[PDB]
């Protein structure tokens, strides 16, 4: 009965824009679960002769969304949603126009699981 969507910003979001964006999406009605995928942000070099060194990435910040602190391991460059109705898909695409300051894509289909695991 549900439909599930992804938002693909043309530029990998910084934590601040991702901070506000994800924050009010949780206020959006009709979301079962959300996903944010993108490049990882290591806290230590794990390859090369400079292995085992401290890396404090500018993009690794404790985003404050919905009164919750989340430590980004990634630069959110893909957001897949979960909505039980299509009339909220109009809502989700609408909000991404206002507070994502650049061009983005918006598809629909089976994205997260829709399948048992383990």
């Amino acid at each position: 009965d549900s439909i599930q969507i992804e938002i693909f910003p043309s530029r990998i979001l910084s934590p601040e824009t991702a901070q506000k964006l994800i924050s009010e999406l949780y206020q959006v009605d009709g979301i079962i679960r959300v996903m944010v995928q993108g490049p990882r942000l290591p806290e230590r070099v794990s390859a090369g002769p400079g292995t085992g060194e401290k890396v404090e990435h500018p993009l690794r910040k404790p985003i404050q969304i919905g009164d919750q602190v989340i430590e980004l391991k990634i630069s959110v460059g893909r957001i897949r949603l979960e909505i039980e109705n299509a009339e909220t898909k109009e809502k989700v695409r609408s909000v991404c126009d206002k507070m994502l300051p650049f061009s983005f894509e918006f598809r629909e289909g089976h994205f997260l699981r829709r399948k048992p695991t383990v």
Binding site: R33, V34, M35, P39, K73, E105, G109, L112, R113, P116
Partner: protein, 483 residues
């Protein structure tokens, strides 16, 4: 309500509703993949007509349909590892070897008609009348056996196991069913017939340098892999057939034989490119992408150039407008693989020629390289740079119809992400023509059986089922293992 953080972007099986994590498509964690390889590995075809000539000459027997019924029942008893002649011996447990059986398919319509219909693969029933006519014309009025030895025996052994086991049990079943002596020259002739003279191996034996043997994935040429996949028998979409062959070949070659590919059978990118290619070919070449032997265009350099360049440009535009599969931490060699597969399948569908598909593959690779300045990892570029000049050469070590190519081909010997595309191209060369088989009708009819634990009609769907812990493979030893 929940917030997920992951950086691996789970794959969704192409043309399906199943999304599987990237580590569920590894053949170690995917039982369907292993079962596919087991079915291909444990399967062999032995003719019944040369043994019948031996029986009728040496012994003076009469080989009637009732004797064949008795002999086939005997053989289906003896093939799973049971004794039929002498006494006081062991026999493989019927629970552990229940995936073993022997069936006969024949180009003789009558001889198939009065044989017990539990041991017969009916060509007319399984195939459309045009494909059935093609198959019967190809094989003649000859009978063949489709032997599938136990999964456990093939797992505990190599792919060289199959012909030996099948020949031993065929000889013993002849001995039991035709009332001939346990040891006599006629028995040897039957053994030599089954083992060599009338045996069709899934793959041939590899050279010394490749430290592996017969009936392995390296001997399984692209024509045999096309014929094993049973989409050309089940559906008429000439592009879906090629895409299914690509999806199965990428797994079987890259993941197992060479030890990435996933993209070819995931996310429906190559499928979209191929369908656009078919539409373009129909629009420009008077619908040559449709089924048929006359509507195909003669394969020339201009045609392949047009088709391959257009396919590559469309793929590049689609990537550059909505990448959605890049950013994988490992580069973009799969981009080149997908583009080349699309171009080659389009060229094959339009021309009905496999080497035209190969030329499209290489032209797409070159257009990729010149448009982006990327081509892949260190490897990868070898095969393309070479092979572009090896498509039409007729020199000895270079040049073969694709159908007769395979992982043991010199250029294709070591690198990943290419051989599945070639199998798909070889399939598409004939699928658009509506042909019953690619290069071997015996393999095409041998795998038109529904008792296989693996569905060779939908290979990619089988991988999807395997990835979600809903595929039951054979060869499990739970009976003998402690609880």
């Amino acid at each position: 309500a929940p917030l997920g953080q992951r950086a691996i972007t789970p794959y969704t099986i192409s043309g399906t509703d199943i999304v599987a994590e990237p580590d569920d498509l590894h053949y170690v964690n995917n039982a369907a993949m292993q079962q596919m390889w087991d079915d291909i590995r444990r399967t062999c075809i032995v003719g019944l007509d040369m043994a019948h000539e031996t029986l009728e000459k040496r012994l003076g027997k009469e080989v009637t349909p009732e004797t064949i019924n008795h002999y086939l029942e005997t053989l289906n008893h003896a093939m799973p590892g049971a004794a039929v002649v002498q006494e006081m011996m062991v026999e493989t447990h019927p629970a552990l070897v229940d995936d073993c059986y022997v069936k006969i398919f024949t180009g003789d319509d009558e001889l198939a008609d009065e044989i017990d219909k539990q041991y017969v693969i009916n060509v007319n029933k399984m195939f459309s009348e045009e494909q059935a006519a093609q198959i019967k014309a190809s094989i003649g009025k000859t009978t063949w056996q489709a032997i599938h030895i136990p999964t456990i025996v093939s797992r505990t052994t190599d792919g060289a196991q199959t012909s030996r086991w099948a020949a031993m049990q065929i000889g013993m079943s002849f001995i039991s069913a035709y009332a001939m002596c346990a040891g006599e020259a006629a028995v040897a002739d039957l053994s030599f017939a089954a083992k060599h003279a009338a045996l069709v191996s899934m793959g041939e034996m590899l050279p010394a340098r490749r430290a592996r043997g017969p009936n392995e994935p390296g001997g399984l040429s692209f024509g045999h892999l096309s014929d094993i996949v049973q989409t050309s028998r089940v559906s008429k979409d000439p592009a879906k057939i090629a895409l299914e062959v690509v999806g199965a070949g990428c797994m079987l070659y890259d993941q197992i034989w060479l030890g990435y590919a996933t993209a070819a059978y995931t996310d429906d990118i190559l499928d979209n490119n191929t369908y656009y290619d078919v539409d373009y070919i129909n629009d420009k070449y008077n619908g040559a992408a449709n089924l048929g032997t006359d509507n195909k265009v003669k394969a020339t350099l201009d045609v392949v150039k047009d088709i391959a360049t257009e396919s590559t440009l469309y793929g590049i535009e689609t990537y550059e407008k909505f990448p959605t599969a890049l950013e994988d931490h490992f580069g973009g060699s799969q981009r080149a693989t997908v583009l080349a597969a699309a171009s080659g399948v389009a060229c094959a569908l339009a021309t009905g020629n496999a080497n035209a598909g190969l030329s499209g593959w290489y032209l797409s690779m070159y257009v990729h390289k010149e448009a982006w300045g990327r081509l892949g990892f260190f490897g990868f570029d070898l095969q393309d740079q070479c092979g572009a000049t090896n498509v039409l050469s007729y020199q000895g070590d270079e040049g073969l119809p694709d159908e007769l190519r395979g992982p043991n081909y010199p250029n294709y010997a070591m690198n990943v992400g290419h051989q599945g595309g070639y199998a798909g191209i070889a399939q598409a060369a004939h699928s658009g023509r509506g042909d019953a088989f690619t290069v071997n009708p015996l393999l095409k009819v041998c795998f038109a059986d529904e008792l296989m634990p693996f569905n060779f009609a939908e290979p990619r769907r089988e991988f999807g089922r395997g990835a979600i812990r809903e595929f039951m493979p054979a060869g499990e030893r739970s009976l003998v293992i402690p609880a």
